[PDB]
Symmetry: D3
Subunit: 291 residues, 6 copies
């Protein structure tokens, strides 16, 4: 019953993803390939990271995550494959996902394979890891990889070997922690009783605005549900509401809701109306919150 | 070989749909998840309804339809799960899908689970139902559901239990008919001998124009194939053509075809050219037809 | 084990693709349906051809390719089903896909089913074929096909019977070569020294520019990796770079790379930046290359 | 030295204004024609009114204002010509315009000629009038006016006769006050200590936002320069600044300025940056202000 | 008293028009410069023609028309200066412009100066001409003309000398009729009964649709006011209305009016709403009319 | 016959420019007001400068240039009024505008009045000046100037007094050279033997591309007419052509012309087609030229 959950920047407009899938079914006949998404901004490693960081607790143990934007395709770089440690706790977000009390996942139960370009930065931060290897063995990659298609050659193909039971430690040599490329995550700042961050994403298709200011940052400031907040975007577009659990708490349709999203980050929206689209709000815009 | 057919407003730009799928495979390991679409206009319950109403006759018996736009997420509302009666929008004669004379489907062979917000209005009207229940059991939903993700908590999760053979009647208490929310469907009005309705959809990616004017409305004003029609749109733009079964009946490429769509509604198109896009025709525009 | 790889112009915005998939699972319960793509420009048979021509070597033997844009839907036309000969564009060696030396695929191991409208022109040219039949038998198509949905009736449905092991030669009468509709492929011309073609596609989502000037055309001029080229787009844009294997060979981010894409065609891009989007370059613009 | 100041909806893209001007120079050889503007939204009488209400104090005594949007062109309607009473005081706005203490204008010194469609509503409100006449005499309009060009026939042409010294009372019969069409001006409301109005205009080319909340309404509420204000636009986009005389009082470039515009209305802008354009703010959006 | 009416493709976004005007005042101190328009599509001589053909009857006798789009700037080409014959399109009666019965204009009373590129084609056709000269004398053009600014050097400058009374016949040698470049005017054709032309212009800023089907073409078919017409735009839009004198005859706001515009051509619009803009109708689309 | 040539950022969509003109005619009854343009990007002092720097040689002696973008409106700043020295950007030989050998203009024949914000930087550099004064006298500005309209109060009004013969030296105290604000003009840098500059403007309405690379920069790297050039734009888009005096030298319509504009700067265009618009070329993009 193996699963590969596949996240790329290949888009869905041509046969690129299908070539990868065909090879996945070829290598691992029993596999199920689940699309995460293929629409990320090409080469935006930070955005790709957002789409994969929270996946493990949702998937059956033993799932392989094939995650790739590969701007260094065709160079001497090689992918990294890592077995993560914890599926939740740090990335708990509530706790375990599923019905009842949720589904507890054993430690060391998920593998990610990716370009070694920092794509896995937040996965490693949130989940930790037990082992990491450079992906070099001709048992799991082509002897003559297509220079402009490493998302296929160096990620899709070896992910299928791993799903098929190829031993992780046999993909190539162990990588020391310092050899795993990471991106810098900008910290939430204090100024002086207010918290200053950024719009991390526009939540399509709804036009909700998500910031990088986390529940932990709020509860550190004595901010919880019911707190009257001022949330200023782009430095000049401000908004005022109490922090509420959900959209409908804003009352009438179109009213402003300030809430915590399902990943636990301070967010702003209109109730059953789009906030970002009419005002052309964008990721990267500053976001400041105060009580 | 259980199937879940999954229709949401979650989009395909982030990991939202994948989180749902991971849980489906977690709960029902042998499941096949089939995407209906995830692109509907958020919170447009009437549009969501059109994408799900005619699904049962195409699917194997025992398929579960997980269908959701959930603007009331995080409120005290709970989903409804219903077993439908007739698979066909027909009866005796049926109009079954498939090769030869098509595949007849037994009655009571399909379950829908959806927010109780009217999404199922036309499914219930066209198909009838045998039983309906409120979805409240912690055996099939989380004890601590994520307030902003009821499409996952209250639809995806329980649909996978249902696919896995969890008894429908055990998801919660029976709902009386009046407790199942319905939307009103605006009637085609009669203006002299013209039928007056609306553009119900622009049929992407083709730019065909679908109206809410049914064959039955037409064959009550004296109109069948071959009839010379005048179809007026948005109160301004006029077209004239005989009613024909298909696009190529219009003759040359670009010529106007007035026809009945595969759902049996009065529609207008250009033959192998887009009608809607160059004239910026839109859903909700008035549509008037006369012989 | 059977697989149907499905390429259509139906889009991903309504239930059209799902209706086809439901019927595929109905007819061939153990099938895996793999999406190629559903976003092609409607009725653009040359574009559809590009998404399907290179598929066979990526898929397990016995895979059925259901490939369809059907502007002649509802007419007396019938689909064609063909068994291809060679899975490669090559053979001597092969450039087989996969890890190690790749997966060699037996001859006669793939079936395409498509409208007989030229969609398979390049499939037939690159792979050859062993047999071809008109798709007419009520064992594999509806007795009463929906006039406006032949992509479902005349492609999806019979593809599932073929996947389930329905004998290919029983779908209908053999077709003679001349009865298989072909489109003309404009040839890459010569004057010089130089080579005059077109932009065949903008490679979404990256904005790379693909030409119809093939590596075999380049070989014909003794043009290889390292050669300083002038590539003029649209008649007035003399791009200059050496031919290199990949994007990063251009050096700095945003620099011009002239390269051979994974399909083997002369292409041009910027290194980890979009070439086509900022300057609105488009398919159909002229492309001239010289050393 | 006569002047006609000319405001129309004819645009500047064809010869329409030039035909009018040629006739003006023909009728009144010594005249100077000054363009006010020709770009108003066609048929928007309220917008046209904004462009003409404040003109008299800027112009030499004896100036004729030819002001026209004529959606009733070619009907039995006839223009109105009015001599206004006061050039300023009510429409003082500071007081008199010009160097030193400004240029005092005698009463009864300006004539407007316009369609009788309410275009002059605010001119009459702010300035009063001494006499008003229907424009019917063949001495000042064509005997056979072009049905679709009353802006020329019934405004431009007679305005030139008036500039040339044709007696105002000879254009046709006197009009009683009730025969002069007026539009309704929505009042600024109180709720309960806040003032609720509308964005009256986006001030192009700067993207400043002008409201219909006047200095008089503010000083009625005890609001003056230095007051810390909250100005909420579109019901949800709020802004906070002190009321200042000018843009640069906001400090850094791009900072929000809340100010009184040169017509004396509460306005909001960014300092040397556009406010309206990045956020797509529009006329008609609600505007609420409170101290 | 002299007047120069100035039509160019120079735009209103830089100092180009002002440079020409400065030179006009330098050469003819007492001149009045009247702008026709400066916004024509550059190099579109047929469009430029439309803005200048009807000017003479609106202006005092002796007016000089400086009219220019000059794509051949900087070549050996020289402008043409012509004295026109008839100020009208008529004569018998005349439909003179102005109050009363209008201002009759003497023959031979207007001069056009233009590039010899066909810009004056319709001026010559409708008005006739008495004399024409090549503009070559260094008394009226620069000895060293700016290569890229012949609209200034070869039109604006000599127009001012002509306005100042420089003898027309002294500008250079007489031109024979065949040396005056003309463009072809596509004829209004017949098949029926019906009349087949084109949309000649979208009438900005209103979005009315003007055709090249003239009142004299309509008279030829016995088509007059009151006739129930079908006007098909773009081949597929059979508009139906009676021919009426003006917009308001259509009744309700937004209703279709088919009318004769002030230039005498069959036109179509909505009553106080834009026809062309919502449906993106364009110049060059086919136009067919029948009764 | 005094002239004021008027350049502002006020636009032509409301009554702002007309208010200024009315006051000009009020103060100087015999004045002619000539519009330069009113469309400049608000607050872009460098762009404003380009529209005014070469005006004097085209205008009669004694013309006053009223030139204004006033982002510091309502502050303690006051305008500067200067009498320039040389009318030509030349000296001996001069390069005079007009018919024959052009019209020589006496030294000290023109006055500019402008905000003291650097708008006059290039006027002063190219022309020199004889005297400069701060504009403060209540004889020429309002005692109570409208805070948000200094373009009217501190430019329009005093320019009309100056046109009327008010002694320049009486507007206020003399300004020392260091008190006249200047902007810095970025130099063309030298990279090997390539000249590196920028796109200074897109030349609307034509879509020609003007660079800041002067003939003098070129004829110092060894480039005159006939020289084969490579011009690279935005660091990506390449063009190649000989330097020619005009557009038609390129041959066929659409062919690339590299030329010197009427201001003597290196420019690039298509022959009677727009270059900038299809490729979305923009001001501020890098421009590099080499022989
Ligand atoms: N801004 C929103 N207002 C109301 N509902 C919303 C909003 N954004 C997302 N949703 C709904 O949340 C459900 C999550 F399961 C989705 O299906 C959206 O309908
Ligand atoms: N407007 C159309 N003209 C011709 N063919 C069309 C049109 N719209 C959709 N189609 C074709 O219908 C087939 C249904 F199976 C699709 O594959 C479209 O190509
Ligand atoms: N233009 C490009 N520059 C650098 N990388 C690119 C470019 N276009 C595509 N790619 C990467 O190639 C990988 C294919 F495997 C994709 O994942 C792109 O990230
Ligand atoms: N790119 C151009 N090609 C041909 N002619 C042009 C171009 N740009 C501007 N012009 C013409 O130059 C004349 C200057 F007087 C203008 O009238 C333009 O028509
Ligand atoms: N389509 C139109 N409907 C009603 N009025 C119109 C329309 N187009 C132009 N106009 C008016 O005609 C007058 C010409 F004098 C202009 O002022 C327009 O307001
Ligand atoms: N928002 C603005 N910030 C700074 N200056 C502005 C703004 N809007 C208009 N202006 C300037 O006001 C002057 C009025 F005379 C105009 O010329 C603008 O430059």
């Amino acid at each position: 019953r193996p699963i590969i959950a596949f996240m790329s920047d290949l888009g869905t407009t041509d046969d690129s993803v299908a070539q990868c899938k065909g090879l996945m079914y070829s290598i691992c006949p029993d596999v199920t390939v689940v699309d995460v998404c293929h629409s990320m901004t090409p080469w935006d490693v930070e955005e790709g990271a957002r789409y994969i960081v929270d996946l493990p607790r949702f998937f059956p143990e033993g799932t392989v995550f094939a995650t790739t934007t590969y701007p260094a395709t065709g160079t001497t770089t090689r992918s990294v494959a890592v077995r993560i440690k914890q599926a939740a706790k740090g990335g708990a977000r509530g706790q375990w996902a599923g019905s009842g009390a949720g589904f507890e996942r054993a430690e060391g139960s998920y593998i990610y394979i990716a370009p070694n370009n920092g794509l896995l930065t937040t996965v490693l931060e949130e989940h930790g890891y037990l082992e990491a290897y450079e992906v070099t063995s001709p048992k799991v990659i082509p002897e003559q990889p297509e220079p402009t298609f490493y998302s296929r050659e160096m990620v899709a193909i070896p992910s299928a070997h791993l799903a098929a039971g190829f031993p992780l430690s046999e993909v190539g040599r162990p990588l020391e922690d310092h050899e795993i490329v990471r991106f810098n995550r900008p910290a939430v700042e204090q100024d002086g009783e207010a918290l200053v961050g950024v719009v991390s994403a526009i939540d399509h298709p709804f036009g909700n605005v998500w910031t990088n200011i986390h529940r932990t940052d709020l509860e550190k400031a004595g901010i919880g549900y019911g707190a009257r907040l001022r949330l200023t975007l782009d430095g000049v577009l401000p908004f005022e509401a109490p922090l509420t659990p959900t959209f409908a708490d804003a009352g009438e349709i179109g009213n402003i809701a300030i809430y915590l999203n399902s990943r636990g980050y301070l967010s702003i929206a209109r109730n059953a109306a789009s906030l970002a689209y009419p005002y052309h709000l964008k990721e990267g815009m500053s976001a400041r919150v105060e009580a």
